[PDB]
């Protein structure tokens, strides 16, 4: 709302409604961190990136070309629909209850409603993220590892809430 996040403002940085915000599985609040070595590495990366425009567009190790990753995403989407395993679902259930209690107590301690609500759609969002992680591997079932990674990604969004 104020351009930069302006960390003292807190919930006043957001003019979005809870209705629209609850429909987002993940809300990455992105802050430009001024660290000196980060800035030096970032500047050298940008300068090299601008310098390298004439290098005949050579292939690269350890990554997928965009044209190939596009086809791979299409293939996985049409082929694989995973589900949660039972123990994975138990893990997700208990972690969700813990996160809900934490969000309630944070709002109570603040005596004000947070702009980001933690709802059953966020539970299903964690489920969807775990299934996407499994679909990358074409596995019919999502494991506790997938649920843990999904919860790790979601706890950035929960950091963004609390």
């Amino acid at each position: 709302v104020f351009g930069r996040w302006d960390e003292t403002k807190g919930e006043d940085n957001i003019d979005f409604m809870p209705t629209i915000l609850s429909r987002f599985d993940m809300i990455f609040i992105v802050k430009d961190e001024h660290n000196e070595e980060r800035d030096v590495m970032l500047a050298k990366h940008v300068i090299t990136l601008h310098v390298s425009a004439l290098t005949q567009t050579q292939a690269v190790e350890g990554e997928i070309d965009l044209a190939k990753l596009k086809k791979f995403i299409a293939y996985c989407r049409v082929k694989c629909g995973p589900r949660l395993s039972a123990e994975a679902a138990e893990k997700l259930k208990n972690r969700y209850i813990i996160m809900r209690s934490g969000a309630r107590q944070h709002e109570r301690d603040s005596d004000r409603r947070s702009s980001i609500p933690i709802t059953v759609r966020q539970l299903e969002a964690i489920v969807r993220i775990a299934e996407a992680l499994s679909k990358m591997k074409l596995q019919p079932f999502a494991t506790e590892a997938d649920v843990e990674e999904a919860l790790r990604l979601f706890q950035v969004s929960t950091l963004d809430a609390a």
Partner: protein
């Protein structure tokens, strides 16, 4: 016969068996088997190829050394070799296995993608220490009488009740104020009187005022099966005890013949025919255990003199010097004091042929010793303080504390990094008193299955090598040579002993007969 014909049939045998010989290998074979007649050549070749297949070959191509070793397996040391019957294994030498939860079995460090242990541990290793302690106890507990209902069990079958374990993440919410629930977790204080329970899923505060303790030494960082109910953000204990123990026979019945203990054998020592037949003739072996061996003062050398006088008959197979060799660890004086006294000990034991040529003099330093401090597993002291002993007493070793002895048919753990009084002085509610103290101590150490069942600031350990301090599967003999009074006891068909502080305890060393599976409760005040 023609050497080309011998080459042709050797190559044909290996090739039909699916194997390719290097040029030097077939050259070795076709000159080694020149004595062989046509009446027996194929039998000889099949014998050799089976011997080759015994090794862990990485390719269908066979090197010269493999054929050489196969012919040696066919001709020499085929029945036994002399050094299998006794060996000494340092803590840093112990192999590492990781318990895969989704395969429900132990895998080697070489098979998992886990990083190799190093002394300067990473932040992950410090967590993995306590997580792995929990993991071992968790898998062991779930295979005891607390096992599945079973889901086939019906009601008329499974008419009697059975325990079902819960994790801390499950007891919050609609599970509040249930009548009976039991949780495996570590007991620890946030602050004095603020007790809590912890597992890899979470942490919860304890109201243990009403708890019926199951008679053990429940310290900080012990793992317990707390039974109670959850309410008002507190777990309210009804009963409180250690997880049940397991014998090594049951452990092997589940996990196979895997060599958890150590040594060069792929299987455990007691599960191979060579050792199983050697133990029939190894009847007369005997070990001696001795702690507070303050040889830096010559009074202890006088004691060693009368020890050699007493036990020159029936020479010991080995002596166990339980560290803390410094009665005067003041500073730099102690280093050359220990070097001179070890020179003196070597000089006196050179006076005999039989003990000098048979008995293994093995040293395991502790806190009051030069080099690395009270950080476990204790490394051996400096080699410049050992070389002069070694060069004129080759039947001797200087190694870690704790340390593992594999006998021909038994397995023993030696440890002296003192903790009995530490167990007594930080019990949650109280210790359990009188002559029962050592029994409660061994119950604690066996149920916890780790030589240090207490916090790191109370007993420091190198993080990545914490697996080396494990007491799972249970050893056949557990020697905990504390400064505490000497004792003997047994639990889950494991013998457990303290040889004690010999200078204080009326000169009470101890001596163990592994082939007889027994020990002498000696007192050498009368020598």
């Amino acid at each position: 016969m023609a050497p080309e014909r011998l080459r042709s049939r050797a190559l044909s045998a290996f090739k039909l068996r699916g194997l390719l010989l290097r040029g030097e290998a077939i050259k070795y074979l076709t000159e080694a088997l020149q004595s062989i007649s046509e009446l027996e050549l194929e039998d000889k070749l099949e014998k050799i190829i089976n011997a080759v297949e015994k090794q862990p070959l990485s390719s269908n191509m066979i090197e010269r050394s493999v054929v050489e070793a196969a012919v040696q397996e066919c001709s020499q040391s085929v029945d036994e070799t002399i050094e299998h019957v006794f060996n000494i294994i340092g803590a840093f030498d112990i192999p590492r296995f990781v318990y895969n939860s989704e395969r429900k079995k132990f895998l080697p460090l070489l098979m998992t993608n886990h990083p190799a242990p190093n002394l300067f541990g990473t932040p992950r290793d410090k967590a993995e220490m306590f997580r792995e302690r929990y993991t071992i106890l968790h898998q062991r507990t779930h295979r005891h009488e607390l096992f599945t209902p079973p889901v086939i069990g019906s009601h008329p079958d499974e008419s009697g009740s059975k325990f079902q374990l819960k994790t801390i993440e499950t007891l919050l919410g609609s599970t509040t104020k249930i009548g009976d629930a039991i949780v495996l977790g570590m007991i620890t204080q946030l602050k004095e009187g603020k007790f809590f329970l912890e597992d890899p899923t979470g942490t919860v505060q304890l109201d243990l005022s009403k708890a019926q303790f199951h008679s053990g030494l429940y310290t900080e960082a012990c793992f317990v099966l707390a039974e109670g109910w959850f309410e008002d953000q507190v777990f309210h204990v009804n009963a409180f005890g250690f997880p049940p123990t397991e014998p090594s026979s049951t452990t092997r019945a589940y996990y196979g013949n895997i060599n958890f203990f150590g040594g060069p054998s792929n299987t455990s020592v007691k599960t191979s025919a060579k050792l199983k037949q050697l133990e029939e003739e190894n009847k007369d072996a005997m070990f001696v255990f001795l702690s507070d061996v303050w040889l830096d003062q010559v009074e202890v050398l006088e004691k060693l003199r009368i020890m050699f006088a007493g036990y020159s008959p029936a020479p010991p197979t080995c002596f166990i010097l339980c560290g803390n060799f410094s009665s005067a660890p003041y500073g730099k004086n102690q280093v050359q004091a220990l070097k001179d006294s070890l020179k003196t000990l070597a000089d006196i034991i050179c006076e005999y042929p039989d003990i000098h040529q048979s008995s293994r003099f093995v040293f395991v330093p502790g806190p009051e010793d030069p080099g690395f401090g009270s950080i476990l597993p204790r490394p051996p002291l400096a080699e410049s303080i050992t070389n002069e002993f070694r060069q004129r007493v080759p039947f001797s070793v200087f190694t870690t504390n704790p340390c593992r002895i594999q006998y021909c048919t038994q397995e023993i753990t030696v440890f002296r990094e003192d903790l009995v009084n530490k167990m007594c002085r930080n019990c949650v509610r109280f210790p359990s008193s009188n002559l029962a103290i050592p029994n409660h101590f061994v119950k604690t150490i066996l149920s916890q299955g780790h030589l240090t069942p207490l916090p790191l600031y109370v007993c420091p350990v190198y993080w990545a090598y914490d697996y080396a301090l494990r007491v799972y599967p249970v050893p056949d003999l557990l020697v905990i040579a504390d400064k505490y009074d000497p004792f003997t006891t047994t639990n889950t068909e494991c013998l457990c002993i303290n040889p004690g502080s010999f200078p204080r305890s009326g000169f009470s060393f101890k001596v163990f007969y592994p082939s007889n599976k027994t020990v002498e409760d000696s007192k050498l005040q009368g020598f």
